[PDB]
């Protein structure tokens, strides 16, 4: 939701074209009273309570809550036997068929989320293998997220990614309350 | 718009077995968008309903309503097509099983009134439908006699049960 920006808008009776004059006098015509042909009652009139402008649904959960959610996702995968640790993502070949066959043989799910430490250093073989696949998605460690972890049936991690996630998520525990945004220099925070 | 009446002539029945009564021929005809009120056409349709083709033509030839001529033309066309295409042996051996008038597509016009006011005229159009069935017209339903009427009353009496008990 927080990324959501609904671009739905409707013209209110003030924004609908025309509708300035009174359609007919109050009294004597024998018809209902009206003040403009663009009120919500009229065909082609305004919308009383419609979507208004681009609306943002942005809100931020506490970073502690989000880190705890990542932790809970990892625990759920491990407990349900969907988590698989790897020494490295290097493949013998870049053929997507090899990766699909390996996943099927090892009884992984129809969808696999492979995670590597950093984007730049991801092996060329796995890059080629996962670029051509739809249900096998390769992401950097920084890109791990609960939504993708839940969407993908199995989660494949490397040892460096495991260490990275452990450090990052455990820091939230035992960190002070911030004095200023952590992007700014701190005595011990990289 | 719907045009099922025209299609009704395209139904083909399976061949009849030798030991089966001869199926009377049925011919569906219609005229669309007649410049005539359906209410007025209904009276002519009711008049000729249930009569033989010749009797209907005779009545229509001497009725003064405008729709009479249109219905006569439709009936003549129906007779011609029944003889030519539907294998009806005799022209006179046809009777009007169905005759109804349907509303057509009408046009809206303006009628000017006395004080800048107006009404919405309707250039009324109507459809006309006929089914011609081969064979003599069915005999008119005879009025129920006193004997049958008393028989019905006695049957009603006999049907009585002891209501609301074992």
């Amino acid at each position: 939701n927080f990324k959501r920006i609904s671009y739905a808008k409707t013209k209110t009776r003030a924004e609908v074209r025309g509708g300035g004059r009174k359609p007919w006098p109050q009294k004597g015509t024998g018809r209902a009273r009206h003040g403009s042909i663009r009120s919500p009652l009229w065909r082609g009139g305004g919308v009383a309570h419609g979507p208004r402008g681009p609306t943002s649904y942005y809100y931020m959960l506490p970073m502690k809550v989000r880190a705890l959610g990542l932790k809970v996702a990892l625990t759920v995968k491990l407990a349900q036997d969907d988590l698989h640790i790897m020494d490295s993502l290097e493949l013998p070949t870049g053929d997507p068929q090899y990766l699909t066959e390996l996943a099927h043989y090892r009884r992984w799910g129809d969808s696999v989320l492979l995670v590597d430490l950093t984007h730049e250093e991801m092996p060329q073989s796995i890059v080629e293998a996962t670029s051509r696949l739809k249900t096998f998605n390769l992401i950097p460690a920084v890109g791990l997220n609960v939504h993708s972890m839940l969407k993908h049936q199995t989660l494949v991690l490397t040892l460096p990614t495991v260490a990275f996630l452990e450090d990052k998520l455990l820091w939230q525990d035992s960190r002070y309350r911030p004095l200023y945004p952590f992007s700014l220099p701190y005595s011990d925070f990289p | 718009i719907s045009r099922k009446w025209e299609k009704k002539n395209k139904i083909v029945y399976p061949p009849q077995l030798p030991g089966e009564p001869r199926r009377p021929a049925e011919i569906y005809h219609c005229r669309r968008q007649i410049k005539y009120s359906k209410d007025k056409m209904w009276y002519l349709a009711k008049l000729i309903r249930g009569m033989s083709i010749d009797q209907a033509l005779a009545q229509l030839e001497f009725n003064d309503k405008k729709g009479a001529k249109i219905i006569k033309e439709v009936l003549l066309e129906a007779q011609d097509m029944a003889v030519r295409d539907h294998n009806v042996e005799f022209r006179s051996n046809l009777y009007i099983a169905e005759s109804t008038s349907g509303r057509g597509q009408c046009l809206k016009r303006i009628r000017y009134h006395g004080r800048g006011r107006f009404g919405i005229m309707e250039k009324v159009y109507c459809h006309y439908f006929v089914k011609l069935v081969e064979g003599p017209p069915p005999p008119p339903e005879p009025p129920k006699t006193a004997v049958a009427h008393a028989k019905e009353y006695i049957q009603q009496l006999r049907s009585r049960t002891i209501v609301h008990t074992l």
């Binding site: 007919w24 006098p25 009294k27 004597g28 015509t29 | 597509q105 046009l107 809206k108 016009r109 303006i110 004080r115 800048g116 006011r117 107006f118 919405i120 005229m121």
Partner: peptide
């Protein structure tokens, strides 16, 4: 005061339509 409500003419296109 005299009360007069002017007649309102419906648009001509509505009644001018043709098949």
């Amino acid at each position: 005061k005299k009360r007069f409500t002017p007649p309102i003419y419906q648009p001509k296109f509505k009644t001018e339509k043709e098949f």
